[PDB]
Amino acid sequence: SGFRKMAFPSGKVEGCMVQVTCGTTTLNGLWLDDVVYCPRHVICTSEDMLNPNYEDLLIRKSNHNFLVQAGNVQLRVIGHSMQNCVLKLKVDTANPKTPKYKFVRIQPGQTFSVLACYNGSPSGVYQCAMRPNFTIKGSFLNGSAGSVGFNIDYDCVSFCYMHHMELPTGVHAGTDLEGNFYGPFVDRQTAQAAGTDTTITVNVLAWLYAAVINGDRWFLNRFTTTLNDFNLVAMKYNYEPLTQDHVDILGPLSAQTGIAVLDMCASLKELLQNGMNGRTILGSALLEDEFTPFDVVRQCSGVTF
Amino acid sequence: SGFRKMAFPSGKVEGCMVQVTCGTTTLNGLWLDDVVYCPRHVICTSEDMLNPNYEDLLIRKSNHNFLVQAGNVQLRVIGHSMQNCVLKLKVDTANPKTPKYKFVRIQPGQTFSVLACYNGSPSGVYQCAMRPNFTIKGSFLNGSAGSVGFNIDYDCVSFCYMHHMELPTGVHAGTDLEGNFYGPFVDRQTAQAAGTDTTITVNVLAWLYAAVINGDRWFLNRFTTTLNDFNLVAMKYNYEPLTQDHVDILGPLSAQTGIAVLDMCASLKELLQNGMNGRTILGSALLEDEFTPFDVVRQCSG
Amino acid sequence: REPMLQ
Amino acid sequence: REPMLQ
């Protein structure tokens, strides 16, 4: 028993991490087949980070300007191009550690593991969620750009995130693996702010189902609610409105426990209106919203990779 | 910036995980050089779990009773012994991916990364602290025994925990890699219960420092306290006494932030006597005590 | 409950 | 504080 914020095993992604140095600046790249993916601002100096013209900074660089090291071995760059906000550096050697993989663009409310890296060396792994405002509450320092977020399905690594920047509030922003930012941010040190955020209701509900599975159930009650009446309460507390797809996605957990999704919404309503009165749920005094229903089933069933 | 429960990358340990089966019961083993370490209750049947005499059970076993599978390859067991509550199965091939490693026994209050595994394959990784009552608050199902906890420094993996069992309150218990249990627990299903627990004071203070490094300061105050005055309040709230060694370990974080340790103690005192008033620190409405001072320095800026 | 060897 | 490219 038990329920923890669990990350995916990182081994398959560790072997794809490389260091990219473009003069004085160094960040991390992702080596899959004969391509190395990295944030484009590796080509910037500190005087350029404000409002860089990346197209003009790129033309000044040639293949030999990019130093790519995979541990104790250097990869010759034999080509370079820019796709949105990432560079694609073609190397003369396909990565022998390339896993089965996909590039996916995730939706707000979905989770992934991050392998934090510095100088091409992995340093930590932790679990994140794409917040409704398209930021992630990560833990990243200078030099972490190019760290990636991923999910694993059986033996296939689904890469969904590469890290680029930190916002003034201390949250983080990055792109998919095609170089498109999540949210309206830009790889620029101009004025930017994350928009209003909300709590991911469908994840809170999944986590309450996880609690029940594990014998933590004091919040269960004999009441019920309609979806519309619940959503009025949800917006009052800056929770994401629940759409019936969310309800569908919670179907497997409702069937496992015999608790109708709308009855669990009734328990969530009372939690929002009356608090937890110093009680805890799965060790937490707040309502946790960074477990998806898939995360719950994955953990509570012991799926392996 | 930011602060998360951060585990060490798990690749080096993933390459050492194997499955061990003795009869109908299966769990995980740790394959280092030509030795596979696993929990001894792999020799038990579902009926031998209440009050096993492991000496009797083991003497009745041969090498060929132990099936070891590393991926889809069968390792030949060529020798076995029992060291406290673990078995050491000598196999005929050394793990070629064995990392530089060491076996260490950690102190209550320290943390480590757990790679939860089933049938020799990894499910996920998460951080755990060794509680003052020698339990850990993990996520472990049947089959998880033999999963290990570890810390990585440079590229040397320091193994410090092997999982064995789940106590009635749902907390978890295991041994060091030499088979000595953490705590007064035994690998049988006779009645057992974890003792009363306490909060790891030095870790709460380290976590407060992390918040300050990450720009949270609402809990700071102009007051100070003596170590003895603080410990009188600490005991009143089920907190471990703060010692001078704990003050010393918080030195770097004190220097970096410019907040005296005893000034942070005054902050914590006021938090304990008045609560947080619905505010939060680093995203938590509870005083977190599962980050060490070392965990803070490893993750935060300088 | 009983302790559970896992 | 300005956004920081890391």
Residue numbers in the entry:
A (entry chain B): 1 to 305
B (entry chain A): 1 to 302
C (entry chain C), D (entry chain D): -6 to -1
Paper text:
The SARS-CoV-2 translates its genome into polyproteins that must be cleaved to release individual proteins essential for replication of the virus. Given that Mpro processes the majority of these sites, any intervention that stops this process, such as an inhibitor, would block viral growth. The crystal structures of inactive SARS-CoV-2 Mpro, with the catalytic Cys145 mutated to Ala, with 9 substrate and 6 product complexes were determined to sub-2.5 Å resolution. As in previous apo and inhibitor-bound crystal structures, Mpro crystallized as a homodimer.
Six additional cocrystal structures of Mpro bound to the product (cleaved N-terminal side of the substrate peptide) were also determined and comparatively analyzed. Our cocrystal structures captured the N-terminal product after the cleavage reaction was complete where no covalent bond exists with the catalytic cysteine. The N-terminal products carboxyl terminus is coordinated by the catalytic dyad. All 6 cleaved substrates bound at the N-terminal side of the active site superimposed very well, defining a “product envelope”. There were no major rearrangements or shifts in the backbone and except minor side chain conformers, the products bound similarly to the noncleaved substrates. Overall, the product envelope recapitulated the consensus volume revealed by the substrate envelope for the N-terminal part of the Mpro active site.
